[PDB]
Amino acid sequence: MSKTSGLYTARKLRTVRRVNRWADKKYRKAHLGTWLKANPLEGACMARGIVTQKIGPNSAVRKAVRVQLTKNSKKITAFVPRDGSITYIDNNDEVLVAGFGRAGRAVGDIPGCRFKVIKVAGIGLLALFLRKREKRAR
């Protein structure tokens, strides 16, 4: 009918699928190569960087920081979620930055933020916000 169905027509089917499977946004983003080069994390679970400045229908200002990745030298912003953790981060402190739940895209009402802060001076943020450990060495 619309599609080919002859007994000697596998080549055309393979070619058609090869051509048409590039139309999916997800497949493109995963197999095209542009995102991997444009992603400052280069496919890594999380990165180690250096902070350099603190900044911050809902009308609540969210606290974040500007960071520069050691291995990449490009600039990004990562947002420190847990309450009272602004004071736990000081200018020019080594940090480890991961991603939000949605890879690539922004999450929530925060404009222009796509990362998270999970470690400072080598201590997990969660372990410090609950007072399990302490940052007396810095």
Binding site: Y8, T9, L13, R14
Partner: protein, 99 residues
């Protein structure tokens, strides 16, 4: 030549059709087969080009059917020699002919 020369026929014997005959004592033979793709449960038609040495004892034109026998390397791309050839007519719609 396999009959009046000093070469021997050994290995595989195959069949094909003549594709070109511009060379001095050589031709190009076309072979047809089928390939099966499991995902789509269908076949594809493929072809290959095979060079052979043609002794002066045969008269061959395009579209004829030839039988080739394997021999030792006779050149960079040649390992076959013709031993038989059936004739064909000039007017004959080309037909996919596995052999």
């Amino acid at each position: 030549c396999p009959f009046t020369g000093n070469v021997s026929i050994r290995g595989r014997i195959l069949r094909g059709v003549v594709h070109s005959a511009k060379m001095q004592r050589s031709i190009i033979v076309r072979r047809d087969y089928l390939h099966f793709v499991q995902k789509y449960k269908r076949y594809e038609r493929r072809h290959k080009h095979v060079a052979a040495h043609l002794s002066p004892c045969f008269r061959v034109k395009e579209g004829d059917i030839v039988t080739i026998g394997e021999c030792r390397p006779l050149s960079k791309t040649i390992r076959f020699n013709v031993i038989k050839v059936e004739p064909v007519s000039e007017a004959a719609k080309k037909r996919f002919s596995p052999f």
